[PDB]
């Protein structure tokens, strides 16, 4: 779509918009109101999914602050949708009954797939991405984090599986190191202290 | 002998620190870790996993 690949990303953010008395829902509603005002005017950390969400918030905040604060208007619309992405990730930051955020998660992952289609096939379809770094970067970044969210969320994952994988890799390298030592450097029957003297 | 007896009753901690702790559990692990990291190449296996 050339310069309307940005309109495709805008449609992705509109899909992100598709997805009570506590302060968190008030914060989400305030962020959505800020998205509405910006769009009409410009024209916790202890889980891996939380890491991706925080990252998304940070990146997309820098994105809005690098494009909107700093078919030409699609370059501002696709960056205005980054605040909707940040609102969705701050909603999922407390993922609070999970059934409230389940549909938000489904819309988030579906439009992350749509952005990871549009922006990924954008260079091969004619348009160029390398031109504007501070504009073009954060949408690719949030699409990446969105996809790895649909991988770290869909399968439970958590820090437990990360620690288990790190321990398995270190354990296999440990047995390789012990075999290498006992076979080439010094036999463990020579290195250790023979008891029963 | 009286002064040695008095000083041996006074100290009672520094002697264990200097006879058990100071080399084997304070200085020698530091020395071997620093020596290994100074010796082995800048490799993930040799710098983290093998030590």
């Amino acid at each position: 779509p050339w310069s309307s690949v940005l309109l495709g990303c805008v449609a992705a953010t509109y899909l992100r918009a598709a997805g009570l008395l506590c302060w968190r829902h008030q914060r989400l509603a305030l962020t959505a109101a800020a998205y509405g005002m910006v769009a009409v005017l410009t024209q916790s950390v202890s889980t891996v999914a939380g890491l991706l969400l925080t990252t998304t918030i940070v990146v997309s905040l820098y994105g809005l602050f690098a494009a909107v604060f700093a078919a030409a208007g699609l370059r501002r619309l696709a960056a205005g949708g980054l605040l909707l992405t940040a609102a969705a990730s701050h909603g999922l930051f407390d993922f609070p009954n999970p059934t409230i955020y389940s549909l938000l998660n489904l819309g988030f992952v579906a439009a992350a797939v749509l952005q990871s289609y549009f922006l990924y096939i954008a260079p091969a379809w004619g348009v160029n991405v390398n031109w504007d770094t501070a504009l073009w970067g954060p949408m690719y970044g949030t699409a990446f984090l969105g996809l790895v969210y649909g991988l770290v969320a869909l399968t439970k994952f958590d820090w437990s599986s990360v620690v288990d994988a790190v321990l398995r890799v270190a354990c296999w390298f440990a047995e390789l190191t012990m075999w290498f030592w006992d076979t080439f450097v010094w036999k463990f029957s020579w290195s250790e202290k023979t008891r029963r003297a | 002998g009286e002064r040695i007896w008095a000083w041996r009753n006074r100290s009672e901690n520094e002697r264990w620190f200097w006879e058990v702790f100071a080399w084997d559990r304070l200085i020698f692990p530091i020395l071997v870790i620093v020596a290994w990291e100074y010796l082995v190449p800048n490799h993930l296996v040799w710098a983290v996993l093998a030590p």
Binding site: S191 | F21, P29, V32
Partner: peptide, 25 residues
């Protein structure tokens, strides 16, 4: 928790850790 932030002796099992000192020196 209930233990101190102190090392463990490496000469309780092998003398091989003593090989690093002269080689590094």
């Amino acid at each position: 928790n209930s233990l101190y932030f102190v090392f463990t002796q490496l000469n309780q099992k092998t003398f091989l850790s003593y090989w690093l000192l002269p080689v590094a020196g």
